[PDB]
Amino acid sequence: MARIKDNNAPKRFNKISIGLASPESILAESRGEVLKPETINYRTHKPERDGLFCERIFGPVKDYECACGKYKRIRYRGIVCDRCGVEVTEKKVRRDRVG
Amino acid sequence: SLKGKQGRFRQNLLGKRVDYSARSVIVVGPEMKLYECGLPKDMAAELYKPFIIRKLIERGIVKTVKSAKKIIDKKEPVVWDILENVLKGHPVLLNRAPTLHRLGIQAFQPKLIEGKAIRLHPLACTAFNADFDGDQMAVHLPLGPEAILEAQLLMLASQNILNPANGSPITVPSQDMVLGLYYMTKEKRSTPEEPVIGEGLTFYSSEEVEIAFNERKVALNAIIKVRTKDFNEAGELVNKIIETTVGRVLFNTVVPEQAGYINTVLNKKSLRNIIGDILAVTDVPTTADFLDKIKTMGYEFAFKGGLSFSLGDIIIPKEKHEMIAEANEQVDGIMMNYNMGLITFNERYNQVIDVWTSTNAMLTELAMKRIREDKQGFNSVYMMLDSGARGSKEQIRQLTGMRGLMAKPKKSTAGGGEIIENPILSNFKEGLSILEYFISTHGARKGLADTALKTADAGYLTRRLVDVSQDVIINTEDCGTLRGIEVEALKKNEEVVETLGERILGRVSLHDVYNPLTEELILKAGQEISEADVKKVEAAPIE
């Protein structure tokens, strides 16, 4: 399959700036808040909701499939499921979304 | 997750594994050119897979990448036909670990070959420190046009003739090549037992010399007279009759013209100097062509001579027993002198060591003389040693004379290893006794352990130097400083080790320099010191 053109253009930069992180900045970059200390369910191996591996905050584990399975395949790209709150997108997003 | 050797910085950012890469065993492709490497068919097919796919879709044979992959996996002849064109103009990069200098990665033009081993040009071995006893090399394929041009114009083997450390040539012929060139360029004089064909003849040019050699009317090592171009005392190119050798004429047939006439017996040192001079007077491509031609000539004339290693070439002197006996009587004299209290224990030990080392030196000299005068200097072992192809004076001494004194393995914390008063009398031709072999095992194991343990320390020193010097990059053409360094000839113990011209060669002059005797402008401020300026300075009384 031809890889989708990720329209997030490679950020051109020649300078690296560092500094203290404001709480407002952390809230702006964060995709959600983590309430429960549980990581996954030991039986179904699915991530617990609002956990350290939750799919509503960090992204779906399976490509183009929501947590509850209501929406599947690429045809629902960009849609957030009303039942589980998980966006239908690539698994690669689980490397960039921050809580 | 950040600090430490296992943090992100030093673990996942400074090194990585790459695609479009390969690795196999390397074999010698002596028929190849300096910029060419032999590439096995499977390796080339896998590395150049997307290019072959592109050409398959362009040819209309397959409309999809899947069908192209199916065709490539079946190894059809059309795949080879396309790969032959794809290889052209698309060099690969050859790397052997450890990469101690930048010559550890070089660009070569790939050629399809049979088998599963990569073919390497012999002249790149010295730069790669690669032999053919089981070594492997990694193959890296540049993709973009910038990378391909970068490889062709900076990393091509033909462009990397010089050593960046000192500027001396690094693609110097070695072993077989040097031995063959030495054999061809050596002279042989006529004797009543072995007359030399064609000695004393005069020739109008190299053309008649080649005609006579091909007609077998003149020997390869015959001393002849030929008329050809050579520099005169003024530095101009004129014809003159010069006494030479047929092999030397044949060698000069491929020498670039501007270098004059080369009329010396070829060894590794003289060959390096000749390549340096040729590159000084000509351009890099001409020097590369010269290197290829002399490589082929040396290989051919080493093959034709059938130069071998036989027990007859290892001539143990007939006087070996007599001087061993004389050393034994001298040691007995020292021992009886000690027993009567005339000398001390340390004095007796020193005298015995002196006697044994004098005997070893005399035996080495006698053995070298015998092997040298054998067959008018055409003994194969002597030709191997004198040319610099392989072997040293000490190794020939061990094969012919006596292995000599050995150091004890004692664990003395204060002093070093003491020398055994009884040396290894026997050599490898005569065979060592059980005791002598057990003695030599100590030194063998010590050397292996030392090398294996200090390679890593040398690597750590290299890493620290790279870390401290990485940020030095030539960014401006001239900073206009009036400050400089005053350079003089390096003298150690009344001996000039580095000449003034050699040290100042390649530098930029601070101020103008005038000849103190003739007031001529030798050097201009802001100008590079070329070789001609080096000669002018060496001629003038400048220190």
């Binding site: - | 450390a165 500027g167 001396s168 390649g506």
Partner: protein, 49 residues
């Protein structure tokens, strides 16, 4: 430079002096401050020239 080059020379290896000169230049890029004056720096501090 002379000492390092002599040690390398004893083993029969020829390396140009310019490499050691480049390294020694980086080895001498800092100064030690003896009096801060009114400046931002601190006593016995190593700073870039």
């Amino acid at each position: 430079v002379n000492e390092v080059q002599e040690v390398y020379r004893l083993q029969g290896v020829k390396i140009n002096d310019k490499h050691f000169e480049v390294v020694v230049r980086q080895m001498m890029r800092k100064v030690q401050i003896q009096d801060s004056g009114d400046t931002t720096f601190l006593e016995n501090q190593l700073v870039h020239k």
